[PDB]
Amino acid sequence: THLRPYETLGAHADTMDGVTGTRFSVWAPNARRVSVVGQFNYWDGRRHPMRLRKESGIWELFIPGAHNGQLYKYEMIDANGNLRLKSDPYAFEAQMRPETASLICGLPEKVVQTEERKKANQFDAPISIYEVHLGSWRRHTDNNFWLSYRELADQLVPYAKWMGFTHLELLPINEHPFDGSWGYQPTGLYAPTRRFGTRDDFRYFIDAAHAAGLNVILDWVPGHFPTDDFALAEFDGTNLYEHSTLIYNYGRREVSNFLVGNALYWIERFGIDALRVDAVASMIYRGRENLEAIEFLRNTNRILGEQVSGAVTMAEESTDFPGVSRPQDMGGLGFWYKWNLGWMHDTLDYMKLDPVYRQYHHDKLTFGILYNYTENFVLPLSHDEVVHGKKSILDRMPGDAWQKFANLRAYYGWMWAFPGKKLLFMGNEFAQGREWNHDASLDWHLLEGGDNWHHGVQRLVRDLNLTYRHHKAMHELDFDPYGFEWLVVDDKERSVLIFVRRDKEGNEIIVASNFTPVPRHDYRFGINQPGKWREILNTDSMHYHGSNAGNGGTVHSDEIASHGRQHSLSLTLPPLATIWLVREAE
Numbered sequence: 022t023h024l025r026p027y028e029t030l031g032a033h034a035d036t037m038d039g040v041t042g043t044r045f046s047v048w049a050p051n052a053r054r055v056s057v058v059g060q061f062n063y064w065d066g067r068r069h070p071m072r073l074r075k076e077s078g079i080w081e082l083f084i085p086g087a088h089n090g091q092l093y094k095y096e097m098i099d100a101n102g103n104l105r106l107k108s109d110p111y112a113f114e115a116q117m118r119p120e121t122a123s124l125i126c127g128l129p130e131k132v133v134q135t136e137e138r139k140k141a142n143q144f145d146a147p148i149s150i151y152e153v154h155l156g157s158w159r160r161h162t163d164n165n166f167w168l169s170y171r172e173l174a175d176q177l178v179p180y181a182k183w184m185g186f187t188h189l190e191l192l193p194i195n196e197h198p199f200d201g202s203w204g205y206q207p208t209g210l211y212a213p214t215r216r217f218g219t220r221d222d223f224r225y226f227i228d229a230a231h232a233a234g235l236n237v238i239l240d241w242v243p244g245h246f247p248t249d250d251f252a253l254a255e256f257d258g259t260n261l262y263e264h265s266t267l268i269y270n271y272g273r274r275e276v277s278n279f280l281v282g283n284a285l286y287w288i289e290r291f292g293i294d295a296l297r298v299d300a301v302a303s304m305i306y307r308g309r310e311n312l313e314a315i316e317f318l319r320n321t322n323r324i325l326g327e328q329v330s331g332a333v334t335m336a337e338e339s340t341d342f343p344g345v346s347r348p349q350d351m352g353g354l355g356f357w358y359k360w361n362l363g364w365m366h367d368t369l370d371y372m373k374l375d376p377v378y379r380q381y382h383h384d385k386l387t388f389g390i391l392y393n394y395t396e397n398f399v400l401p402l403s404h405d406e407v408v409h410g411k412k413s414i415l416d417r418m419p420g421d422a423w424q425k426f427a428n429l430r431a432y433y434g435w436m437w438a439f440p441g442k443k444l445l446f447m448g449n450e451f452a453q454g455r456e457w458n459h460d461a462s463l464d465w466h467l468l469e470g471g472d473n474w475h476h477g478v479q480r481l482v483r484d485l486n487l488t489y490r491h492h493k494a495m496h497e498l499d500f501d502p503y504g505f506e507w508l509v510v511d512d513k514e515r516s517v518l519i520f521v522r523r524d525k526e527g528n529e530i531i532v533a534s535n536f537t538p539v540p541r542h543d544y545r546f547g548i549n550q551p552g553k554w555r556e557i558l559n560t561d562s563m564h565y566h567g568s569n570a571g572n573g574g575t576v577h578s579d580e581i582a583s584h585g586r587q588h589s590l591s592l593t594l595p596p597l598a599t600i601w602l603v604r605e606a607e
């Protein structure tokens with residue numbers, strides 16, 4: 022089968038006549054002479070040469086004795102007669118850095134995707150994603166050492182679960198030489214990085230997240246050609262993998278296979294539930310449409326949908342290509358979800374404003390609804406927004422510290438109610454003050470000592486996650502106009518916005534935000550479902566170090582017309598706060 026080349030190519034365990042060893046395979050159409058230099062070979066390129074079969078362009082050889090755990094490389098004479106030693110491109114495990122040898126290990130057992138994890142990826146599911154860079158989430162304190170995959174299984178997984186997230190999204194765990202690329206500049210697509218342990222350690226981590234009831238999304242980097250360690254370029258002396266600045270030759274059948282293969286591998290051999298492709302614009306552009314890139318993405322998506330249904334793909338595309346998360350049969354790219362960068366830009370510009378000026382930019386909060394139904398959106402507060410002098414999310418907020426925290430609380434309240442799934446970068450849940458530093462631990466010291474405003478934000482994010490998951494109105498109909506309706510879309514003067522989220526049964530949750538520090542008392546607005554209403558979420562609660570203003574129990578609607586509706590509520594709206602209300606059955 023052509024889809025799963027990692028099941029044949031590379032180093033696997035084989036049984037050629039009683040004797041055991043490993044069979045090596047490499048694809049290099051126009052090289053001449055390739056030998057296998059391992060640990061079993063005293064590292065001698067005279068002892069073990071490979072026999073090429075020219076129909077496929079694949080060299081191969083079976084070596085008895087050669088067992089799992091042994092380092093190895095390929096010694097190749099390239100088209101030009103140069104001696105270069107190459108890493109196996111299908112290295113399933115790579116030796117500790119510097120170094121670049123591959124390790125014989127073979128494949129892990131296939132992971133079957135469970136019904137409850139497939140359900141967890143569906144469009145009607147509450148999806149709240151904790152985005153993490155494994156190298157900088159936590160460190161050991163005395164020595165500043167990385168946490169291993171296994172320590173991450175014992176600390177990060179329980180933390181994410183308790184905080185009420187449904188998904189853990191990982192910056193690329195591909196093998197990569199430079200910590201500073203964050204994993205986006207890989208050298209070994211099929212080996213999880215050795216920074217945190219072995220490939221079996223990574224697998225234990227994935228297993229642990231699943232046992233805790235978490236789906237795992239992996240950042241997958243099919244758009245960043247390896248540019249380090251002569252790892253993939255001019256692989257056999259010619260432009261094997263890359264186009265004739267370095268970029269994959271997607272239209273070339275085998276290359277495409279190498280990449281679609283890689284997706285299938287993470288999902289099938291590691292149990293990953295979803296992949297995210299960054300920087301899609303620079304795959305499809307940079308009239309300038311790279312037609313081979315567009316068809317490759319269309320293809321890969323088609324194949325995953327047929328082969329591993331239940332798994333999903335997500336995309337970040339920054340030029341408004343139409344139909345990124347739409348079906349290929351139409352103009353689409355075939356992704357299930359798209360990052361809503363426009364929403365992130367508009368709402369942050371809005372929150373940055375001195376509250377006194379927000380009346381003039383009401384547009385920034387109401388625009389998201391206009392194009393909400395063109396893509397299946399994730400609302401993202403990602404690692405890219407908290408580096409390079411962009412500041413932390415907290416530090417973007419205006420005012421003295423206490424006003425900053427209140428603005429940030431009100432904003433999360435808004436984000437968690439607004440149509441679209443949720444993604445939050447580590448550090449944001451406890452309002453880290455400093456920018457993200459991939460070479461240090463996050464600022465957990467902020468949570469040391471007596472209860473403070475950072476604990477307050479952290480409780481709020483948990484309550485938001487648990488509330489968002491419990492009520493279907495908040496998540497069931499994000500991508501259906503029936504799921505959302507403005508109750509007060511034009512109170513610009515006071516910067517009060519009020520809408521309703523709705524589930525399939527037609528139950529409504531009312532969402533109200535007051536984006537200025539003026540408290541509003543007896544604020545009357547029209548509603549759709551008369552009766553008794555009660556707060557289920559209040560970002561000004563003392564439980565989060567707010568001032569504890571609010572409605573103080575059940576409020577009954579009145580038969581007094583408002584905003585073209587026949588019944589209304591008259592509520593207190595706390596300053597710099599958002600509240601959610603539910604209707605009580607009688």
Ligand SMILES: OC[C@H]1O[C@@H]2O[C@H]3[C@H](O)[C@@H](O)[C@@H](O[C@H]4[C@H](O)[C@@H](O)[C@@H](O[C@H]5[C@H](O)[C@@H](O)[C@@H](O[C@H]6[C@H](O)[C@@H](O)[C@@H](O[C@H]7[C@H](O)[C@@H](O)[C@@H](O[C@H]8[C@H](O)[C@@H](O)[C@@H](O[C@H]9[C@H](O)[C@@H](O)[C@@H](O[C@H]1[C@H](O)[C@H]2O)O[C@@H]9CO)O[C@@H]8CO)O[C@@H]7CO)O[C@@H]6CO)O[C@@H]5CO)O[C@@H]4CO)O[C@@H]3CO
Pocket residue numbers: 384387388389390391394395507510511
């Ligand atoms: O081709 C690209 C699309 O965008 C282009 O839109 C341009 C406008 O035509 C142009 O006038 C101008 O608009 C800007 C405007 O000047 C600013 O003031 C501001 O608008 C704000 C507005 O003032 C606020 O009130 C608020 O709007 C909310 C609205 O008040 C509220 O009721 C609700 O709206 C829903 C309606 O209740 C309901 O009727 C329905 O309306 C549908 C429509 O019936 C249906 O045909 C649907 O199908 C298409 C649509 O026709 C297309 O036009 C397409 O948009 C493109 C335009 O053609 C471009 O010209 O979108 C739909 C595809 O799904 O369109 C309507 C939307 O469903 O549903 C409404 C939505 O629920 O919610 C709104 C939103 O909160 O907020 C506004 C602040 O953003 O901003 C305008 C943008 O600049 O410039 C536009 C250029 O982008």
